[PDB]
Amino acid sequence: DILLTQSPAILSVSPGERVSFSCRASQSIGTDIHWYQQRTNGSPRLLIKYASESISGIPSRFSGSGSGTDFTLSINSVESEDIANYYCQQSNRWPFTFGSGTKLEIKRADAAPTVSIFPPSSEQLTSGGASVVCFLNNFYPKDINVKWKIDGSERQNGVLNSWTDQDSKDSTYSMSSTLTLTKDEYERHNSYTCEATHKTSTSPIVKSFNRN
């Protein structure tokens, strides 16, 4: 069966630059290669068929080239919406096979996180639970740290974090940090604070609220 090697697995380019993805077949397959784009949580979408043929609806920005064993997918002037995984697929011999995929990453200007803290809702408290939610949004680079403090003292128990993949809207990243406590535990404390430390500032960005 035909092995399709896509390497490198991650390509990082600057906005507006021309980028090229590589797909190498284990044996010669003519021009029977097709390329798909798959955005985060999206289904694959065909971009180019038979190595270089355009697909209606696809921006003119995309093009393909090559024949034999080496194929290239190129994007002239990359933009945020191009952030996604890209896969090649061959149809020369049975069975059809797929390459392992290349992720496109865009290196944009640094951006500090927009931090928002949210007290638990009354609907949730009513059920005996209390979640305090903090959003660290639209920052770059993706490296970031969040620290919780309850009544001025660092808190670590009950904190779950989640980070998004690079955003296809503006090339930034976002993260959520959720501190969950029982209603009782929540009721015996005053101030809750979320602190974000990011490369864009020597001092942490802090947001807090008081239960009263």
Place this chain on the structure above:
Amino acid sequence: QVQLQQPGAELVKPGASVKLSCKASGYTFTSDWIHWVKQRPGHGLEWIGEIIPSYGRANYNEKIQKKATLTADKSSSTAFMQLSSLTSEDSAVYYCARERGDGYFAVWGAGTTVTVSSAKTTPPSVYPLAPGSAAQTNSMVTLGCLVKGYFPEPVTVTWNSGSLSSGVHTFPAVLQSDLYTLSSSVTVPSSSWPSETVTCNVAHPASSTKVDKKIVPRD
């Protein structure tokens, strides 16, 4: 219109089997083949097999253990994939795709997220996320909704029934104690809320539930 329609999710206990469906619309030809592709979270696309509806013949990937059996119904223009005796290794999104006999997959379904687990289905509790009273706003305000205690994946969150897309971030779910939780964030000009309403819509295919939570300022 959507060319290939697949159900959003199926929960399956280890050892049980499930039959996935893919309803096709648009132009149909005798040369069409419907393919199935498996994708585990964070991994690539794996071909499972194909069937040609016009004749009913199916072929399968020989490199992997055969978990699938393909069939197709001509009158209902539906293709089926029977997965049997599943294990956690079978948990993944399974896409159906249509190939016009010319080697490329012109269109893909949205995929069915299949979770193999003994755990039970549980709809999510949706709570509002509105700023506290001391929070100062800029030209923009951020709101959100907390979706917790659901199983299995996935949930789909939209804002204002889909009309509000820009400025939205839905975070990946976190799994703790057989239950998932995530939150979604939306940012609108501070001047437009609460004058213009903001509601998050949360769909949980596995439990056939879809709830709305309007976000209003804290009393």
Place this chain on the structure above:
Amino acid sequence: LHWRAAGAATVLLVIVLLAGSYLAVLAERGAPGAQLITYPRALWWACETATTVXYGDLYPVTLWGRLVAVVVMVAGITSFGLVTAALATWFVGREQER
């Protein structure tokens, strides 16, 4: 008689190239390494097979693909024997006459 046998053979040949193209793909998919697996090139393969040219760019590797190939071959060859026999019949008459 002859022209109708020839005309019919031509119509029948066109049907065999299209059905042969469809059946060859049906037969060959599922056989690892098979290349006669998409319809446009299978129609091309049926044409270069029926004319007996047989470049070797594409060919069947399965039992049913090969049976389909032999039917295409014989359909092509037969059509041509019929056209040839029809031309001979035509000429023979016009020459009796001349």
